[PDB]
Every structure is written in structure tokens, then in C-alpha cells.
Design a protein around this ligand. Structure first.
Ligand SMILES: [Mg+2]
Ligand SMILES: [Mg+2]
Ligand SMILES: [Mg+2]
Ligand SMILES: [Mg+2]
Ligand SMILES: [Mg+2]
Ligand SMILES: [Mg+2]
Ligand SMILES: [Zn+2]
Ligand SMILES: [Zn+2]
Lengths: 132, 103, 218, 343
RNA sequence: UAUACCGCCAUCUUCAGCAAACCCUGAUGAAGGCUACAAAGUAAGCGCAAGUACCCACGUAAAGACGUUAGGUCAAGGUGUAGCCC
């Protein structure tokens, strides 16, 4: 019995999404990686820095868009430009949404001295994969 | 109000409805059968005791011989004998006042 | 209100669909319906229906047989004229083909295969929320191969469904509404019952069609 | 550190400790329970220590058709906001933790006199609001299993009734109390027993019977008598709609068997119309309030019998020495006639 | 303080059962629900299984639920409670 990135089977009143429902040994088999970079490949370097910076990015953005997200993020780093993709809910105002979008993008750019962009996809209620 | 029109008033109906007054009251006591003698009185030195009976908690009500449709609420319409105070949920003092008023 | 009048009109009349035209004690004796199992296979509640015994066998009272069969045909025909759902049961494998085929000739439905646990009680969960359970049950064989009361009579007694089973000396006619004493085992009697039900329900259906056509005219 | 920090749900789990040793075996704890709370839902995302005024999220963006500008909330206004937010949090916590008043039924910490409201609507659609529900008793049944040992299974017994002579009992077993309540309620509403009554408040005649070493003796009574019987039978009498009778239980005291035998008797009791139709005579009631006047109750639907019944003298009848004592009056007991509660 | 815990794993497991939700039997008790030439069981869902990785479809890996051992770990890290807070 191993407990690793999995949900305990309940009576069937727990909405669960794809990535957190599926096991961590289904990553390459029935999932995709949240981030995409080449530091893991051979010949590259700075992989530890990549991991630290993307963890801090995910934490900071989760906490500066709190209560609206309903799933993990998608990171897409093509050379220099960084791209973020999020799924959120539509309870707060587009005013606040755009304000925080610009705020976070400017902060990330000024911190990492890197061109950054981020996109968000609206959902009325978080999609559920199954009831476990 | 000293007259008996507080009963005909609308607050009485919404507060009670069709049931009698004693039907709503409930006694807190020891286990099983309650005591055979109710409390002596519900008010003392212009002070009310916890868990008072309904006729005592509702100060607007008045024990008067003339409030007929209130008096005959306790004594059964089917049996002329009055109910006892442990049944009606009221204390012995106001129960005796009610007995003398009904007589 | 006239719809209720039409629904109630056949009630006041006795033998209104002419169900007596079908059966006669001659035909019953020819089909050997009067037979019964041995006295060892006798049953208490079946005692009063036995006319007598001979050679360790049982004989059915044919007057009572005809009375109960008349009542059964009348009830089934009333329900057919009212479009009340009918459902046949014959757990006997000896006649499943013929019974399903006469059910096809009638238009009504049947279940001769193995009966599943709680098929009637839990039918909502099995089929769906909105399902019209049948309004009348009939039994060409009340007992199963193990000689046990088929669970359908119990289910009907519970859910207030009327039942009409042909009862043999081994059967339990207590829960049955219109139990018909007879010979469950003989193929002649089985075919007779099937043809009688064919005629009855088909006459009821065609007469309902006639009456509704007459009212469309009027 | 900030990198060491992490999301809330796992902290809440680690703090509440719902599972891991305490919850299993049913040992639990000594009445200590950490209440769940959500801090993100409470405060709006805008405010902080430095009270910058945000036109994007904190302040409306446009005022008088003029774009706003970033500004400073003075320290007095900051203290006002802090004070009113403290007040709001205290009010939220007050509304959160409060009393719970389930009306006292038979006694405290007992599920006897409490009603769960009418049954739930059916799937096809069947409102049973006319029905009222009551919980007769609750118990903690235990059976053991191979690997996990003792299994706790809440069994409950419930009754339901109109107040119109129609009612039904049932029982429900489940691991959860509310689930058992729901199951028992559904089964009771689906399994109903109807019984007739004479004049809306009495049984047709007194009955003495037994069921599984549980002797029952119910006695018809006149008007204004009340219900001086067991508390369960009083509750189900309220459900049925009868207002007065007497009853006594002798032998064992097992409320389920009591109810089975009681409904059996109340179902097997004979109506007076049925009695007249069976015998072939006119039923005649006589009262103590009314003088020597025969009040015809019912007549046989069929033809009346010509010959009346013969004089039945010294009939062979089995009765109870207790009733004999109570009738002769020599019996004495402090526990018989008490000024008990209302009905 | 692992006898508050989260997180992470040993164990039977070289297992295959676990089960929301309904119905039925036992006089409406704890409990049980199997007979296929078939007699009251129906089953969401999980797991097993299947497929996926290596050289295949076998094999090896992986996976291996509900739960026992208050199993180990407040010393990966955090956290409830109790303390030091010259
Ligand atoms: Mg392992
Ligand atoms: Mg108490
Ligand atoms: Mg331990
Ligand atoms: Mg496998
Ligand atoms: Mg492995
Ligand atoms: Mg240990
Ligand atoms: Zn007083
Ligand atoms: Zn036979």
C-alpha cells in the first residue's frame, strides 16, 4: 500500500479531476507534464533553478489568484518567452481579473528579467472526472 | 389590558392557534413520573423563575371570572371536572386562583 | 365523465363479454383437467376443492372449477377491456415456447424463464423511475421445479397486484385472488387455458375498439 | 520559510486528525473536537496592513466619470477597518458556535419523542407531508469481523402516521445514524398498516393478547379519559389520531415486539358493522351520561335474524386476577393512580 | 507527545475481494441472501483484471483496494497540545 499523489476512495461524494485522480505512475502513460523545459534533458543545466523558480511561480500565482483556480497550471517555456495557462472560475469581476493579470505579469517579468505571458480559461464550475 | 380582548386579539391566535394554552407548556423535572405537587408560584418579589407556566409568563393574560372562553379551556368540555395542576402545567397558586375564579 | 361511464358500463352486466361461450365441463373432462396428484401430494387448503379420491389420486370438483374459471375469464376480460396490463407466468419449461407464442397471438406479455430476486419489488431501480408495473398477473404453473411457491404471488400480495393462477393439489391458493383448480401438468389443459385466454382477451380488445369507434361516431 | 509553506487542506487534515488511530476502534476522544474554518472566504482580497486604495479590486474603478488614482488609507482609517473586521470575525464565530435545541422528547440524550418531519418525496413524485414521523428507539449494535474486528451498526426503529387511523412501523440498519433514519422512514412509509376506530378516539373493544412473551392488555375508555399508557404507545396513538384509552404491558418489555403485537391486535379487532353483519343483530350502546336509552350503533347489512340469542348464563370466560382486584377495589398501590404528565 | 496528525512506507498481498444505493428472509433480532435442467437477490463505484513500459499476445516489471499490527517516522518538512521563551 503506497500513498503518493492519489485520492483515498470515498463513498462517492468527492468530485475529482483528471490529474489528481490518476496515479503518479500514469504520468507518461495517461497524463502530461505540467511544465515543459529542457533542463531535464542531457547537456543542459540550471535544472534545480528551473524547478525552484517554477515552484515559486505556481505558489505565488495560486495565492494571488486564490479561490478561482480549480486545477494545476500549464507552463510552456519556448526558449526565452515564458507562457502560463490557467483554468479559473467566473465568480469575481473581469475588472479584478485583468488587474491581477497585469499585476502578476509585470511582477514576474521584473523579477525574472524574462518576457512572460499568461492566459486564463473561464469555467462556471470545475469539471469533475469522477465521483470517488 | 384589564379587559379580556387580548384573547380575541390576533397575537393570541398566531401565538397559540387552535390548541389550548397549557398544551404548549412543558415541565422540566426528575426522571419518569414528575412530582405530584407543582411549584408554589412562578413569580416572587416581582421576579420570574426559570421555566414558568404559560399563564404566568404571559403577563398580558388575566385570571378573571369573566374571561369564559379562557376559563373553560382547562376543564374538559366532555367532563365537568377540572384538570389537576400537574396536568395543566401551572403552579399551585395560580391554579387555586383559577379554581376560585371558575367557581 | 362519459369515459368513466364507459369504464363502468360492463360492470353492472353479468357475463357481459359472453365468457361462458368458451368452457364446458365436457371440454374440461376431455382435457383431463379433473386430475390431481396423489393423496400424499394433497394439500389442506386444496381439500375442499377435491371432489373425491380414487387409487391414491385426487379428483377436482368441476362445478367449482367452472365457477372459478368463469370468474377468472371475466376478470381478465374486464381488465383487457380497460387496457389493464396483463402478465403471464409459466416456470414450466415444457410449454414455454407455446405460452410465449400465444402471448404473441394475444398481444400480452409473459415471463416463463427463471424469475430473478426482487424483479417486481425493485423494478423501479431495475428499469427506471417512471415504469408502469403490470396490473394483472396470471399463472399457468404456480409452483416451481422445487415445488415452492413462485415469489410472484408474494410480490403481488405485497404490492396489491391481482393474481389468477391455476391451482393444483400441491399449490397454495391462499394468496391467489381467483384461484382456478385444475391440472397444471396436462398439455391438453394447458392448450385449453391458452386458447381460452386468447379468445377472452382478444374479444375484450376488439370490443373496446368497437365501443371507442362507436363513441367517435357519436 | 515561504518555500516551506503550503496549501491549507493538508494543514487542516493534520490539525483535525480525522483518521490514523483515534477514529478507528470507536475509541474517539474525551469530547475534544477542532472545528473547521475557512479564512479565505472571510476577508476580501484587497485589505492589508498598508491600506492602499485599489481602484481595480478595492474601490470602484470610476467615480463621477473620472479615472481614480492610487491613494493611501490613513492610519486612523486603517485602525477603523481593523476594528470592524475584528468585530465581523467575532460575529461570524458567534454565529458559528451556538446552542442546538432538539426538542426534549422522552428524556435528554434519548431519541424517543423526536420527529424527523414527514417522509421524503418519492422518485415518481409522492408528497407525504401529511405523515408525521417518530423515532421509537436507538441502539448501537455490534458484530465482529475477521480483519477489522468489531463493527458498529446503528439500528433504529421508527413509526409514521397520519393522525387519521393510518400508520406504519419499520426499522433501519446502517453505519450512519442519518442514513438509518432515512432507510427506516422510507420503509415505514412504504409499509403501512391501517386500523379502524369507533368514534375517532377509541378502539372498538378491549383486547388481551401475547406476542413473544410480551403480554398486552388494551382497554377501551370513554371521552376525557386521556392516554395513560407507555410512552411509545402514547406517541403512536398521537400518530394514529386516537385521543384516549388505557393499556398495560406485562412480562417482557421489548418495544419492537410490543409494537408488532399491538398492530396485530389493532388489525384483528372487529368493527361493529362487521359484527352486526356476522351475527345478525342490532348493536346497542348504553352510556352512563345517557340514561336507560338504547343507542343503535349499526344494523346488519343483510336480513335481520328473527330469533335473538339465547340467555348466556355463567359463561366460560378466562380473565385476569388483576382486573378482578381492581374491580373489587381491595387492591392498593401507590404506583397505580398518579398525577402524571399531560396525557 | 508517531497514543493528535498531515505527508511517506512495511505487513497479510506469492490476497481477491471491498462496496454506496434498493429489495427480500428470519413472526420486521442480532444476522443472512448460494444452487443455472437454477429456489431472492439486483448493483453504482473501487480493486483485481484488461491494456500501457521492456523484445511479443507469454514473461519480467509496474499495480496490488477495505482493513489488523494505537506498525515506523513530531529528527525529510510542517502542524495540534504541553514547555524553554538569560
Ligand atoms: Mg511496495
Ligand atoms: Mg437531562
Ligand atoms: Mg504507532
Ligand atoms: Mg494485473
Ligand atoms: Mg513495483
Ligand atoms: Mg506503536
Ligand atoms: Zn406561578
Ligand atoms: Zn401438477
Amino acid at each position: 500500500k503506497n500513498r503518493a499523489a492519489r485520492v483515498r476512495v470515498s463513498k462517492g461524494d468527492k468530485p475529482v479531476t483528471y490529474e489528481e485522480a490518476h496515479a503518479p505512475h500514469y504520468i507518461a502513460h495517461r497524463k502530461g507534464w505540467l511544465s515543459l523545459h529542457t533542463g531535464n534533458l542531457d547537456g543542459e543545466d540550471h535544472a534545480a533553478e528551473r524547478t525552484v523558480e517554477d515552484v515559486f511561480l505556481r505558489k505565488f500565482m495560486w495565492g494571488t489568484f486564490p479561490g478561482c483556480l480549480a486545477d494545476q497550471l500549464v507552463l510552456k517555456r519556448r526558449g526565452n518567452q515564458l507562457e502560463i495557462c490557467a483554468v479559473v472560475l467566473r465568480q469575481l469581476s473581469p475588472h479584478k481579473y485583468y488587474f491581477l493579470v497585469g499585476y502578476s505579469e509585470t511582477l514576474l517579468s521584473y523579477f525574472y528579467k524574462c518576457p512572460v505571458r499568461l492566459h486564463l480559461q473561464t469555467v462556471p464550475s470545475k469539471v469533475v472526472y469522477k465521483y470517488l | 389590558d384589564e379587559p379580556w380582548k387580548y384573547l380575541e386579539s390576533e397575537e393570541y391566535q398566531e401565538r397559540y392557534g387552535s390548541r389550548p394554552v397549557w398544551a404548549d407548556y412543558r415541565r422540566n423535572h426528575k426522571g419518569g413520573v414528575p412530582p405530584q405537587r407543582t411549584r408554589k408560584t412562578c413569580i416572587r418579589r416581582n421576579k420570574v423563575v426559570g421555566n414558568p407556566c404559560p399563564i404566568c409568563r404571559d403577563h398580558k393574560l388575566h385570571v378573571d371570572f369573566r374571561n369564559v372562553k379562557l376559563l373553560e379551556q382547562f376543564v374538559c368540555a366532555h367532563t365537568g371536572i377540572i384538570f389537576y395542576a400537574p396536568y395543566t402545567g401551572v403552579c399551585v397558586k395560580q391554579h387555586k386562583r383559577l379554581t376560585q375564579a371558575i367557581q | 365523465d362519459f369515459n368513466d361511464k364507459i369504464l363502468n358500463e360492463p360492470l353492472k352486466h353479468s357475463d357481459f363479454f359472453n365468457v361462458k361461450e368458451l368452457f364446458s365441463v365436457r371440454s374440461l373432462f376431455d382435457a383431463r383437467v379433473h386430475l390431481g396428484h396423489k393423496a400424499g401430494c394433497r394439500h389442506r387448503f386444496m381439500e375442499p376443492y377435491i371432489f373425491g379420491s380414487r387409487l391414491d389420486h385426487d379428483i377436482i370438483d368441476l362445478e367449482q372449477t367452472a365457477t372459478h374459471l368463469q370468474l377468472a375469464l371475466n376478470f381478465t376480460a374486464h381488465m383487457a377491456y380497460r387496457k389493464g396490463i396483463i402478465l403471464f407466468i409459466s416456470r414450466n419449461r415444457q410449454f414455454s415456447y407455446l405460452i410465449e407464442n400465444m402471448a404473441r397471438d394475444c398481444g400480452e406479455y409473459a415471463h416463463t424463464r427463471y424469475f430473478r430476486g426482487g424483479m417486481l419489488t425493485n423494478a423501479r431501480l431495475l428499469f427506471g423511475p417512471t415504469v408502469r408495473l403490470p396490473d394483472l398477473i396470471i399463472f399457468l404453473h404456480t409452483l416451481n421445479n422445487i415445488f415452492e411457491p413462485h415469489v410472484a404471488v408474494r410480490d403481488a400480495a405485497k404490492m396489491n397486484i391481482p393474481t389468477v393462477g391455476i391451482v393444483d393439489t400441491n399449490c397454495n391458493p391462499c394468496l391467489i385472488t381467483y384461484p382456478v383448480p385444475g391440472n397444471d401438468d396436462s398439455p391438453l389443459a394447458v392448450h385449453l387455458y391458452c386458447r381460452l385466454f386468447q379468445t377472452a382477451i382478444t374479444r375484450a380488445k376488439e370490443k373496446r375498439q368497437q365501443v371507442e369507434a362507436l363513441y367517435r361516431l357519436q | 520559510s515561504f518555500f516551506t509553506k503550503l496549501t491549507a487542506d493538508e494543514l487542516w487534515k493534520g490539525a483535525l486528525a480525522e483518521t490514523g488511530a483515534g477514529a478507528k476502534k470507536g475509541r474517539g476522544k474525551r469530547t475534544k473536537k477542532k472545528k473547521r474554518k475557512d479564512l479565505n472566504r472571510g476577508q476580501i482580497i484587497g485589505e492589508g496592513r498598508y491600506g492602499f486604495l485599489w481602484p481595480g479590486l478595492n474601490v470602484p474603478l470610476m467615480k463621477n466619470g473620472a479615472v481614480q488614482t492610487i491613494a493611501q488609507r490613513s492610519k486612523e482609517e486603517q485602525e477603523k477597518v481593523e476594528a470592524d473586521m475584528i468585530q465581523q470575525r467575532e460575529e461570524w464565530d458567534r454565529k458559528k458556535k451556538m446552542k442546538v435545541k432538539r426538542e426534549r422528547g422522552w428524556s435528554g440524550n434519548s431519541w424517543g419523542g423526536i420527529s424527523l418531519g414527514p417522509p421524503d418525496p418519492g422518485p415518481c413524485g409522492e408528497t407525504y407531508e401529511d405523515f408525521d414521523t417518530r423515532i421509537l428507539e436507538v441502539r448501537n449494535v455490534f458484530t465482529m469481523t475477521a480483519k477489522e474486528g468489531r463493527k458498529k451498526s446503528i439500528r433504529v426503529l421508527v413509526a409514521v402516521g397520519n393522525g387519521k387511523g393510518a400508520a406504519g412501523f419499520s426499522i433501519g440498519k446502517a453505519t450512519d445514524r442519518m442514513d438509518a433514519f432515512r432507510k427506516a422512514k422510507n420503509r415505514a412509509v412504504h409499509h403501512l398498516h391501517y386500523i379502524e376506530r369507533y368514534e375517532d378516539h377509541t378502539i372498538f373493544h378491549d383486547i388481551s393478547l401475547r406476542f413473544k412473551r410480551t403480554h398486552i392488555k388494551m382497554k377501551k375508555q370513554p371521552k376525557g379519559y386521556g392516554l395513560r399508557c407507555h410512552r411509545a404507545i402514547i406517541t403512536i396513538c398521537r400518530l394514529i389520531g386516537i385521543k384516549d384509552m388505557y393499556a398495560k404491558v406485562s412480562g417482557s418489555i421489548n418495544m419492537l415486539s410490543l409494537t408488532q403485537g399491538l398492530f396485530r391486535g389493532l388489525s384483528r379487532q372487529e368493527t361493529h358493522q362487521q359484527l352486526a353483519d356476522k351475527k345478525g343483530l342490532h348493536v346497542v350502546e348504553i352510556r352512563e351520561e345517557c340514561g336507560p336509552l338504547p343507542i343503535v350503533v349499526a344494523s346488519p347489512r343483510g336480513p335481520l335474524r328473527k330469533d335473538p340469542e339465547p340467555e348466556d348464563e355463567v359463561p366460560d370466560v378466562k380473565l385476569d386476577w388483576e382486573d378482578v382486584k381492581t374491580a373489587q377495589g381491595m387492591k392498593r398501590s401507590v404506583w397505580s393512580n398518579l398525577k402524571r404528565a399531560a396525557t
